[PDB]
Amino acid sequence: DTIKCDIPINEELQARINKHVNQLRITYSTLEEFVDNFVYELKKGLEAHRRHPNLWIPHECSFKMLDSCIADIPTGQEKGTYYAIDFGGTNFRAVRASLDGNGKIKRDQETYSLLFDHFAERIKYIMGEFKDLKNVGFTFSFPCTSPSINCSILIDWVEGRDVCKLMNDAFVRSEVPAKVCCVVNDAVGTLMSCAYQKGKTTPPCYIGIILGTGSNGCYYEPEWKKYKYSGKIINIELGNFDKDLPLSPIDLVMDWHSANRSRQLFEKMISGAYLGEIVRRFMVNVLQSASSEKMWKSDSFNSELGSVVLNDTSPNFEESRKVAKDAWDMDFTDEQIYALRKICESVYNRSAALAAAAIAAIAKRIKIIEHSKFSCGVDGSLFVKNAWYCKRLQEHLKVILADKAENLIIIPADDGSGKGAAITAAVVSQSS
Amino acid sequence: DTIKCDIPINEELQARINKHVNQLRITYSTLEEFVDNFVYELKKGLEAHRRHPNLWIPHECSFKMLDSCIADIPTGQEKGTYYAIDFGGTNFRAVRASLDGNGKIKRDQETYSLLFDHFAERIKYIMGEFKDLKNVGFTFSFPCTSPSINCSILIDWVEGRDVCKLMNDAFVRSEVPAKVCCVVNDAVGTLMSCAYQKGKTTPPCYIGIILGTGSNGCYYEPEWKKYKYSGKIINIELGNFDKDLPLSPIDLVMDWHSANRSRQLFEKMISGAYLGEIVRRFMVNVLQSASSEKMWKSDSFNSELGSVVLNDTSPNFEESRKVAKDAWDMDFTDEQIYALRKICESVYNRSAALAAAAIAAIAKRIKIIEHSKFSCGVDGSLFVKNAWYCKRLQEHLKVILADKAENLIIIPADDGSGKGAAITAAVVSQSS
Amino acid sequence: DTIKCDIPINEELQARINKHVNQLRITYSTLEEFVDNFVYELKKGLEAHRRHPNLWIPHECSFKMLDSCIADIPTGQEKGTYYAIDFGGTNFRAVRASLDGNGKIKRDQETYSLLFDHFAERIKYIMGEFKDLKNVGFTFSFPCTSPSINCSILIDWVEGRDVCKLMNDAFVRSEVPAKVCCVVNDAVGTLMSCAYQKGKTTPPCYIGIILGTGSNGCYYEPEWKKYKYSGKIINIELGNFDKDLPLSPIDLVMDWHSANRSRQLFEKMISGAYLGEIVRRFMVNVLQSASSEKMWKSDSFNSELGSVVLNDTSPNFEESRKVAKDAWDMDFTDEQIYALRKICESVYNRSAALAAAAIAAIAKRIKIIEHSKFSCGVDGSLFVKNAWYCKRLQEHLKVILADKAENLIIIPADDGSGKGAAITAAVVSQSS
Amino acid sequence: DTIKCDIPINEELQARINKHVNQLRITYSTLEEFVDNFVYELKKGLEAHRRHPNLWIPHECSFKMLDSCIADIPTGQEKGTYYAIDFGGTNFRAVRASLDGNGKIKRDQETYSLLFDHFAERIKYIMGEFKDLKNVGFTFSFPCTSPSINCSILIDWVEGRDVCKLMNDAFVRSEVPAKVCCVVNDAVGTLMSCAYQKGKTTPPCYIGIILGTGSNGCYYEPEWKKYKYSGKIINIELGNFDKDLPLSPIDLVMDWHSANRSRQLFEKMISGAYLGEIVRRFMVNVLQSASSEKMWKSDSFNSELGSVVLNDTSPNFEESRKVAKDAWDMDFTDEQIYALRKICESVYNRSAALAAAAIAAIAKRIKIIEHSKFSCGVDGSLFVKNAWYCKRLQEHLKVILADKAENLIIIPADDGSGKGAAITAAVVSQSS
């Protein structure tokens, strides 16, 4: 499974490669300490929430264990039609989903356009394009605290009013009879969308993981009653884990230029928005003076190109060296292309190992893994659109869980921020 | 200034008294360390606010340095009529204040009655009693964070909506044309009410202190621009200071039964809501078996009785031993009445010393005390309705500030939660 | 197993008893959090030692995981004669032990007398009393750090020289040809003495526990090679555990008068030197005014009397109320004697539960408990000389380890500070 | 005082220079926060020592405030001859000093050679070379804790015995009648040597500073009696200050490769053993691809070359570009030599500013600076053998102390580890 060298490599470049690979090496002895720290942090977060479920106090637990206020999960037997709003950065979409009683979802369109007074006409605009004249979901990936499932406040980016009723009154100002009923997170929607579209002869899903341009997790905590939680599903803020991470110096520099400094140190090692910069810096270090002038720019390499480099099988890597030219205007030789492959294979492997040791921790906090069986729905831009990264995540997950790997199933879910919010708004209302 | 014994005291009781007095003794060497810790904490809080002015992170600074979003202070030259709402616990009042251009306030009534749908009719009910048919202030002493001067959220006790517009729409639902325009704290209103009613030949006020059933402070920070503050007045959450306090064991037990545990340890040593319990516990310890059966109850002694015991000049203390009987159904002898006086004189003296060392710290953070002169407006139930406590606070304040005591003036302000909110709503609107 | 009341109890005293019993109640839900915190602390201590095995850094781990520098444990097959020195406080002993090859120890005398220049003549004085004219052990329970097995430094109480060679040169100054070869702790000697005198058909011993006027533990860590330890046996400083303890307010006051303040909070809840004060304070609180004048003294009740109260079976508790009079000069009635019994039964039960949850943690860090079997040697003044405390410790230990209680055996060892140091000095030398 | 550019610089290289200079910029607003943090840390260290003067607890204070056990300082009126031993790394010296009663020292030799059994013959070997046949000092720069002035223990590098008597018995084994009487630090010897050789018309010295291949400080604390100190001079472990430092990313990487990781972060920014690496890394970053192959080696540039670059006045910098070739085998052009000068001038200026703000803090803890006058003796390899670094340290020290700069005098002391230990051994013995 490891890259093999046949071309004669210089001594200096080989020494540099060997020195910079052992800075990204994750042995099966550190992964156990990682799993233990993760489980302990989960438990401490639960207790600290029970002590004061309103404010999040750092230095008590890195995970701000949020709670979706949902009542119960779906089973794949409902029916209707429901609409959902996604709102991230500059331009995002609107979803319409039809639900039959057989565990299947039908979706129509994801319209993008470049301000609460615009979205009501947007919903009427997509609705007239179906003209079958209720309740609408909402994702709203922004800094918000949700005391209840219907409302959530805004504390960052009228910038401070209720972001729920703000959207609600735009339907009243217009003709549209549709009300907001849920403000879900990106991962709980993933959990629900995976639970719906499973089937009937599959174990229940208990963990929803997002690995993409951001990393997060939600899971079903059976002891939710012993603490003060109202929903059966708990949203871990997984990206903020900082107990003991194997940080190389490149991770110490790339964090200083972050504009989010000293925050979210676990997300900056495994997420797809940061792997391109890691491999760029490592390549600059290993090709000291031979590096081009473009290899010193900031955003000169993103993870979509690492995906191209990893999934390469040509006799001569004419695709792996065509992605070099258009990014770094440089004609790579054989030793340099070998170095590039050996660096990407290390960075992505570390990401996959650390993201596989965070699923075993969740599956170990739930003490079901000993006897019963259950499933996990993994979604994201790193899991999809990458083949070398799936069979590696599931290889590490098959070694962390030594004798129990067969009890935990992986089911790739799709489109959490969409179908998820629609299914949540359908469940919270049809079963209201 | 110290109590003198002439009656022959038993040896055991004298030993116990001497042992329990030295547990409440504050020497002029510890007060300096206190002042230094306080000043350092103020500076650290300012910096930590500049780093992230949204969330309060404990273990960065005990003071959550809030900010009133006011523009500028009054001078005593405005005019009009304005109404204010107070809302604490079970039953609180409504205020109407007339303002002339000479630094004088005229107030009408403080009606009490035992639920946002009731207060609009309350305001119309007080208004019809003057029938001179704008803007209304609001104090709202509850857990709230205020991103702006007009709005504030509710996170504790619809329990979560906007507590500003909640009150505002009740005037629209009714006929009353009055809108909320400010949600002030108990101490910034004190500052403003003191600034208004000063005169013309007095130094400017810079600190507003509340010492009562609760302790708090607000002050004018001249470096407000260097950090991200929008108002010239900063609200210290002074009650939460916990750096290094001289805690006796009685303070360790009375905090365990608090229902606010491990929070606000500086407020539980100096505020008027906790001195009665302190003196009750100390009396139980010094009168071991001679204590009555009522001296073991919880709320059997409040600070209004300590005020009676302190301000006593009768030949035979027939008032200090009449407050004993009706509270602890017991006929005190001479040694016991001496012990009671010597215990109250120690508890209240420690409170006064620690509250005088917290004014010197604020007056030292403002570096004006070296050359110029300014004033401080002290308000509360301990300052008013107690004579032994004023000339003692100002005795300690005259020894902490060795050569500068003449630069700082004390001006007793009155009724902060009332006239304060009215004057703030008048200034924010007439000078809008 | 619980005390039963038949005599009619007053309402007030019954309310007070019920209120003060629930402050000492340990449910089987908190014991699990205790075990988890203990195991995590053990692991963190091991890692922190590997990072810097010289200085102990608090806030890294409460346990300063010391190391005995022993080579290997005995098996009960050696032979010879060896001498040991004990040195605690004012007056302590000297031991002579003969060792045959069958797992049996023969001891002679423990002489007490009320200064390194005296102990050599003491050893010659005990030796002449046997006149069979090598190597001598040493316990030396004082503040000392031991870089090697032969030497240890002194940092508290020439007060600072080498406390090993100090004793060694006194044998050279005299005629005695005996040299110090080991400075062991009170618990590793217990471990060795238990390992020797086991037999041949018993599982191996792995934990040595001391529960007396002080609490401590040592255990065999199989992963000693992965970290920088030279001995197979690790000395936990178990008394300093302070992660999350169920502290009543009486424990908050009794710690303030400690002269060892904010240090060793786990030892002050379970050790035999502190249970008498706990029960004295609780009795003062429950018998508010009926308490005598002697119940307010400090050392008016020690654990030897609680042992007498617990192990009482007379028809009328003429022994449990005879221990009252000579200690508190008071003729207890029936309700008061019931209260006293119900208070001692709670204090000692909490101690036994918390000391049984600290053995399960050690037995869980060693992952052998799943399949194999092993033993633990418990010694101390609370285990011996108390019958109600053994069958209660082993009742809680049979419920903490649900399905594995049969894998762990309890073997009461005796005289650790004696036979232990002798056997260690014999093993380190005969097998040198 | 700033470098001026006249040669036309490229746009890219100019942008890089301007971007990397503002990462080393120290404004007069941060220096005040630095001084405040330093003073607070000093006070906290003093208190924490008073609470437990035996063990050093980090997270209480970064400064382990050690204490020299000296009685009193010299005045320059003694007489005699005394010998001193220095012992650092591989090869170090022996000193002989003659002392007259006029404040003048006469020194003979510093012999170097490449093991306590060798130093006695070394002392006899230097003594026979003067053949004027008492007491000997000792510096011994190694990890050691000194409970008393005569003895000190060894805990790192027989490796653990008494390093005082170890040297003492070598004089008895030989003929030499010379005994060790003091084990001083590198900075207290500097203080004493400065105090001796002052004169008679100079203010008293109170601070001794070492700025070289290591940074440290000692000072006279007038409140030494209020705490448990026996000597009037306190040894700050100044290099370990880590409260809030302006760390660039280069300092984050150079610390990861330290072998002393997460320890002594203030020493790694200002000391002469680390400035060459800083400027090397910055030069690699600013000359991205134009850098040579030798500029990527580790020890390719030490501070002796930065001293050469700074003190350059030739028309064409034929010395500043001759130090480039022999170190980095590269013919620098004009833009590159300008960049090199502008980088060294920034690194050394930051070091000088931060080392000048640490003298103002010490001079501010002693409250004498307000009225009286005193002096400070600065020694080290950065102060001596560098002219641009003295008039810059004293320029920053003249701006930090706004109105008091004339009260504090700087007196360059010489050879602390030598004359210092001799003078200390002379004072401790002649005035014994």
- 3-class SS letters over chain C: CCCCCCCCCCHHHHHHHHHHHCCCCCCCCHHHHHHHHHHHHHHHHHHHHHHCCCCCCCCCCCCCCEECCCCCCCCCCCCEEEEEECCCCCCCCEEEEEECCCCCEEECCCCCCCCHHHHHHHHHHHHHCCCCCCEECCCCCCCCCCCCCCCCECCCCCCCCECCHHHHHHHHHCCCCCEECCCCCHHHHHHHHHHHCCCCCCCCEEEEEEEECEEEEEEECCCCCCCCCCCCEEEECHHHCCCCCCCCHHHHHHHHCCCCCCCCCCHHHHCCCCHHHHHHHHHHHHCCCCCCCHHHCCCCCCHHHHHHHHCCCCCCCCCCCHHHHHHCCCCCCHHHHHHHHHHHHHHHHHHHHHHHHHHHHHHHHCHHHHCCCEEEEEECCCCCCCCCCHHHHHHHHHHHCCCCHHHEEECCCCCHHHHHHHHHHHHHHHCC
A3: amino acid identity, one letter = I
Q: Where chain A is broken, by preceding residue (C–N > 2.5 Å)? A: 114, 133, 157
| Alpha helices (H) along B52-148 | 116-128
Contacts of A279 (CB under 8 A, 6+ apart): A301, A306, A340, A343, A344, A347
What CA–CA distance (Å, rounded) separates B271 from B286?
23
Assess A157–D contact: CB distance below 8 Å, yes or no.
no
Distance CA A200, CA A401 (A): 26
CA dist., res. D230 & res. D228, Å (int): 7
Query: CA–CA distance from C209 to each of A342, C230, C356, C383, D303 (Å)?
Result: 53, 21, 11, 10, 57
Chains within contact range of chain B (3+ C-beta pairs < 8 Å): A, C, D
Q: Tell me how many residue pairs between chain A and chain B have CB atoms under 8 A apart.
A: 24
Chains that touch C (3 or more CB pairs under 8 A): A, B, D
Euclidean distance between CA atoms B307 and C85, whole angstroms: 64
Q: How far is CA B3 from CA B278, B337, C205, in A?
A: 19, 12, 67
Q: How far is the C-alpha of A281 from the C-alpha of A253, rounded, in Å?
A: 10
Instruction: Report chain B's C-alpha Rg in angstroms.
Output: 23
CA distance C26 to C297: 29
Between A36, A43, A47, which is nearest C43 by CB?
A36
**CB of A36 less than 8 A from some CB of C:** yes
- Asked if C381 contacts C343 with a C-beta cutoff of 8 angstroms, the reply is no
CA distance C85 to chain B (A): 41
Beta bridge partners of residue A80, listed in sequence order = A99
The single residue listed with the structure tokens 């903490």 is C400
Would strands A205-212 and C408-410 be described as parallel, antiparallel, or unpaired? unpaired
Report the C-alpha gap between B139 and B186 in whole angstroms: 7
Q: Does D47 contact B36 at a Cβ distance shorter than 8 Å?
A: no
Residues A221 and A188 sit within 8 Å (Cβ to Cβ): no
Q: Residue D108: which residues within 8 A CB-CB, separation 6 or more?
A: D95, D96, D97, D130
Distance, CA of D213 to CA of B334 (rounded, Å): 73
Q: What is the spatial distance between Cα C214 and Cα C217, in angstroms, rounded to a whole number?
A: 10
By residue count, chain B amounts to 432
> Residue C358: CB partners within 8 Å, gap ≥ 6?
C34, C38, C217, C238, C241
DSSP 8-state assignment for residue D66? E
Q: In what order do the strands lie in the sheet with B205-212?
A: B66-67, B233-236, B214-220, B205-212, B374-379, B408-410
Tokens of A160: 């401070």
CA distance C51 to C45: 10
CA nearest neighbour of C408 among C358, C379, C355, C371: C371
Number of C-beta neighbours around residue C337 at 10 A: 18
Nearest Cα of chain C lies from the Cα of D184 at a distance, in angstroms, of 18
- Distance in Å, alpha carbon of A203 to nearest chain C alpha carbon: 28
Distance between CA atoms of A36 and C42, rounded to whole angstroms? Answer: 13
Structure tokens at C263: 């240090």
Q: Please check whether residue C23 touches B, CB under 8 A.
A: no
Q: How many whole angstroms separate alpha carbon C98 and alpha carbon C80?
A: 6
Q: How many angstroms separate the CA atoms of B348 and B367, rounded? A: 30
Burial (Cβ within 10 Å: 0-12, 13-18, ≥19) of residue D338: buried
d(CA C383, CA D314): 86
Residue D252 sits at the vertex; the CA angle it makes with D250 and D255, to the nearest 5 degrees, is: 105
Task: Locate B156 and state its tokens.
Answer: 């504790």
C147 in contact with D, Cβ within 8 Å: yes
| Minimal C-alpha gap between C143 and chain D (Å) | 11
What token pair was written down for C302?
A: 């020690």
Cα four-point dihedral sign B325, B331, B334, B336:
negative
B249: Cα separation from own chain's centroid: 25
Residues 6+ apart with CB under 8 A from A386: A307, A310, A311
Instruction: Tell me the chain C residues in contact with residue B288 when contact means C-beta distances shorter than 8 Å.
Output: 293, 296
Domains of chain B and any CATH numbers? 1-68+197-415 (3.40.367.20), 80-183 (3.30.420.40)
User: How far apart, in Å, are the Cα atoms of B48 and each of A144, B61, D28?
Assistant: 21, 7, 19
Residues 6 or more apart whose CB falls under 8 angstroms from that of D138 comprise: D84, D85, D87, D164, D167, D180, D182, D183, D184, D421
Phi then psi for C186, rounded to 5 degrees? -70, -25
- The pair of structure tokens assigned to C204 is 């191996």
The rounded Cα D62 to chain-centroid distance in angstroms is: 18
Alpha helices in D135-183 (DSSP H): 165-173
D265, D248 Cβ separation under 8 angstroms? no
Mapped onto helix, strand or coil, the DSSP state of residue D234 is: strand
DSSP designation for A209? E
**What is the enclosing helix (H) or strand (E) of A234?**
strand A233-236
CA-based torsion, C223, C225, C226, C229: positive or negative: positive
Cα-flanking dihedrals φ and ψ of residue B42, to 5°? -55, -50
Method: cryo-EM
Per the CB < 8 A criterion, the answer to whether C416 and C208 are in contact is yes
Dihedral sign (CA B269, B271, B273, B277): positive
Q: Alpha-carbon distance A299 to D222, whole Å?
A: 58
Residue D211 identity: L
Site of tokens 């129509």? A108
Give the residue from A44, A244, A365, A367 with the most C CB atoms within 10 Å of its CB, the best one to mutate.
Answer: A44
* Total length of chain A: 432
How many CB pairs (< 8 A) connect B and C? 27
- The SS3 of residue B59 is coil
* A253·D253 Cβ contact <8 A: yes
Residue B69's alpha-carbon distances to B43, B109, B234, in angstroms, are: 20, 28, 9
Cα C180 from Cα C172, distance rounded (Å): 12
Token look-up 């780093």 returns B51
Q: In this structure, what DSSP letter does residue B311 have?
A: S
How many Å apart are CA C62 and CA C236, to the nearest integer? 10
Q: Quote the CA–CA distance of A202 and A205 in Å, as a whole number.
A: 9
Helices (runs of H) and strands (runs of E) counted in chain A: 13, 11
Q: What distance in Å separates the CA atoms of residue D70 and residue A188, rounded to the nearest whole number? A: 68
C-alpha distances (whole Å) from D11 to each of A295, A410, C225, D14, D255 are 18, 53, 58, 5, 32
Cβ-based neighbours of D27, under 8 Å, separated by 6 or more: none
Task: Tell me the backbone φ, ψ of residue A3, rounded to 5 degrees.
Answer: -70, 140
Q: Do D293 and A293 touch (CB under 8 A)?
A: no
**Nearest alpha carbon to residue C65 among C291, C279, C289, C221:** C221
Instruction: State how far the Cα of B91 lies from the Cα of B114, in Å rounded to an integer.
Output: 5
CB under 8 Å to B55, separation ≥6 — which residues? none
Q: What is the DSSP letter of A162?
A: B
The token pair at D99 is 């002392």
- Report chain D's terminal Cα–Cα distance, integer Å: 52
Amino acid in the structure at residue A102: N
Query: Tokens in use for A19?
Result: 């020195």
Chain D, residues 165-204, CB within 8 A of chain C, namely: none
Q: What's the CA gap between D53 and D231, in Å, rounded?
A: 13
Q: How far is CA D384 from CA B160, D237, D387, in A?
A: 67, 22, 8
- Measured CA to CA, the distance from residue C186 to residue D336 in angstroms comes to 69
> CA of C280 to nearest chain B CA: how many angstroms apart?
14
Q: Is A39 on the interface with B (CB under 8 A)?
A: no
Contacts of D326 by beta carbon, 8 Å cutoff, 6+ apart: none
Contacts for C169 with CB less than 8 Å, ≥ 6 apart: none
Q: D275-286 and D303-310 helices cross at what angle (nearest 10)? A: 70
| Interface with chain A: mutation pick from D23, D247, D265, D288, highest number of A CBs within 10 Å | D288
Residue type, A284: V
Distances (CA, A) of A302 to A90, A257, A386: 20, 17, 14
Q: d(Cα A280, Cα A92) in Å, to the nearest integer?
A: 30
C-alpha–C-alpha distance, residues D306 and D323, integer Å: 9
B170 conformational bin, left if phi > 0, alpha if psi -120 to 50, beta if neither: alpha
B296 touches chain C (CB under 8 A): yes
Is residue A261 within 8 Å of A253, Cβ to Cβ? no
- Non-local (6+) Cβ contacts of B116 within 8 A are B166, B167, B170
The verdict on a CB contact (< 8 Å) between B153 and A153 is yes
Site from B265, B277, B289 to mutate, C interface, most C CB atoms within 10 angstroms: B289
- Nearest by CB to D147, which of C59, C151, C160? C160
Amino acid at A264: Q
* Resolution of the experimental model, in Å, one decimal: 3.3
CA angle A97, A99, A100 (to 5 degrees): 155
Closest residue by Cα to residue D15 from B371, A38, A297: A297
Give the bridge partners for C375, in sequence order. Answer: C205, C409
Q: Which two tokens stand for residue B25?
A: 């003794």
First-to-last C-alpha distance (Å) of chain C: 52
CB burial string D298-335: b at 16+ within 10 A, e below? eeebbbebbbebbebeeeebeebbebbeebbebebeeb
B71-B77-B78 Cα angle (round to 5): 70
Query: How far is residue C316's CA from residue D232's CA, in Å, rounded to a whole number?
Result: 69
CB-CB contact of B407 with B374 (8 Å): yes
**DSSP H or E run through B356:** helix B334-365
| B155 and chain A in contact, CB less than 8 A | yes
Q: Is any Cβ of chain D less than 8 angstroms from the Cβ of A256?
A: yes
Euclidean distance between CA atoms C310 and C295, whole angstroms: 19
The two three-digit tokens of residue B134, written as one number = 């704008």
CA pair distance C361, C43, nearest whole angstrom: 11
Q: Which chains touch A (3 or more CB pairs under 8 A)?
A: B, C, D
d(CA D390, CA D400): 16
CB C244 within 8 A of CB C42: no
Strand partners, C376: C207, C410
Q: What is the DSSP letter of A419?
A: I
Q: Does B43 touch chain D (CB under 8 A)?
A: yes
Beta-bridge mates of residue A212: A214
- For chain B, counts of helices (H) and of strands (E): 13, 11
Distance from CA of B61 to the nearest CA of C (A): 20
Taking contacts as CB-CB distances below 8 angstroms, the residues of chain D near A296 are 288-289
Residue D84 φ/ψ, nearest 5 degrees: -140, 150
DSSP class of residue D407 equals G
How many alpha carbons lie under 13 Å from residue A156 in its C-beta half-sphere?
9
Token digits for B123? 């305001």
Sequence-ordered list of residues with C-beta below 8 angstroms from that of A313, at least 6 positions apart, any chain = none
Among B253, B261, B281, B286, most C C-beta atoms within 10 A, so best to mutate, is B253
Q: Which residue in the block uniquely carries the two structure tokens 């026979």?
A: D128
Which among A363, A379, A365 has a CA at the least distance from the CA of A412? A379
> Which two structure tokens, joined as six digits, stand for C102?
């069958």
Alpha-carbon distance B316 to nearest alpha carbon in chain A (angstroms): 52
> Which of A252, A292, A296 is opposite residue D253, by nearest beta carbon?
A252
Contact (CB, 8 A) for D204 and D373? no
Instruction: Give D106's strand partners.
Output: D98
CA of A52, closest CA in chain B: separation in Å?
Answer: 11
